[PDB]
Amino acid sequence: LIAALDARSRRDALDFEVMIPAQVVQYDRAENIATIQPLITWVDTEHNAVQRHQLVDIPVISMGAGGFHISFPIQQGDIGWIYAADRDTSQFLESLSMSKPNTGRIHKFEHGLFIPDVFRRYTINSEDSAAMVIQSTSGATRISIRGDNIKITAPSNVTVDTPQANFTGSVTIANTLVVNGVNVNNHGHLENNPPDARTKGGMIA
Amino acid sequence: LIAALDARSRRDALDFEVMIPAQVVQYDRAENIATIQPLITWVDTEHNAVQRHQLVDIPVISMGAGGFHISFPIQQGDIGWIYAADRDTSQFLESLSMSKPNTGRIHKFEHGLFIPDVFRRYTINSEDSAAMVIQSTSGATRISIRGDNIKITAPSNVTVDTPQANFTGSVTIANTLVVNGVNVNNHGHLENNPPDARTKGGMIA
């Protein structure tokens, strides 16, 4: 009989984990690890599809290198993809350096990586149809990068916290400019004649 | 004979899909799914290397969590990597929640994830050699993050669309400042003496 190896091959492929959609149960942003719940059940011999185990202490990617990175404020319930490492990563995670596997389990989500993905749960404004956006998923607060311009939109404010902000060209401000507490639109100056009289009105062309 | 299992092992490994470079045939940015064409052929028994099938309805990652994400304006022809999920993801994609596989196909690109990658098709300006950049691939329009400063460059304009933009330090503008339609470089004020005469010239030190 040859059905034997067919059965084996199937079992072995089912047991070998690679990638599946998954959800955050809990997340620690300082240690950048999560408890993760896979979101596709597996059919058992009994033909019952059942919920998979949680995975603990799973690193969540923070893309970055060279002293820079991108970090999202991950919440319980957020979704993404868990990947299974070839070997136990637990010692590597302790040291972030060259390590041995502490165990013999291979190709299992238990030692994996979670990559957050919002899937389709976002809105792109029509003006950004040809742009890259880094944004709230609502689309309300965004940095939009286009081929020759950048547009930064926020319903409340944009705050630039730095000692020196430099503009190498011109600047146009639609409404009010206040500098050190003084409204420039409406400002004046003391005259020499009449002595110490403030000029009339505000700033004019 | 023992060559039997050697043949099996090889077949099974060839059939088990994980990751391959691939190209976007069509993309829907609202549903965040693509038709994808793998870019490496597979050699058949006949020793013919032939083009692989398109995959439809493949989610394209939008990295994000916590109400924020990053989205690129993916175009036909863009490249990247397709990953094969362990099990059918179609029901999960309908609901974005806990689900069963609708079918028995495992480790196939048919149910996968596409991650866009520009590979080497970009230019980094020399001034950004030690910086992170989020930019047009031409390098012309960029946000460059350095250890202690941020430089935002755009050939046309940078527009900040918000009711209130706050600078916590000083600001230097090279050229013209216009506020509510009035050129500040060149502005003046009405005098009390001579009555209602505009001051001479523009703004001076």
Added chain:
Amino acid sequence: LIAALDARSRRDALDFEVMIPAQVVQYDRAENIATIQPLITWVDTEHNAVQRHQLVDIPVISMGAGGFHISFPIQQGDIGWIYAADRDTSQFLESLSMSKPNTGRIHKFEHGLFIPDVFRRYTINSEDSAAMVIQSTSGATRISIRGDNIKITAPSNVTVDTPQANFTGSVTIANTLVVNGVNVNNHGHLENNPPDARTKGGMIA
């Protein structure tokens, strides 16, 4: 005996590479490829755990599409995850187009993709606990995106290099504003009477 296939299955799973943590040995940012050193040893038949081979010419992801991307200034020693492609990618990498495998090696890191990950080696400021940040890993220089506002922080400066910067609302500047070399806080104007006398002091309400 049936232990035979158990041994085979195990061997085949060990030989089949998918994903493991790894480190950059060398990186070329123009060609966007690296020499990579996996960071988990593998136990051999002799029960010796030993360091894995370097992989050369490994593409490092640059997430992007549609003419935009994100690039980090990767350094020797930076860490992340290497993924194994199903087939030889070398011809595909030459052309970035549809290709055959040059060889028969399958599911090996030798032809792979590296994704940089900083793991937990970063600091999130408490004010950003619910925000997305793109930042130096020190947390000192950052773009922080919140539900209705964006805060850009840099200890040295933020420079906006563009011919035209537009603010669609109001702007408040805490300290000094200089426009074309003239300090606005302290500016004045020539009077008509007294003829050509500069106004007293600086700008006042």
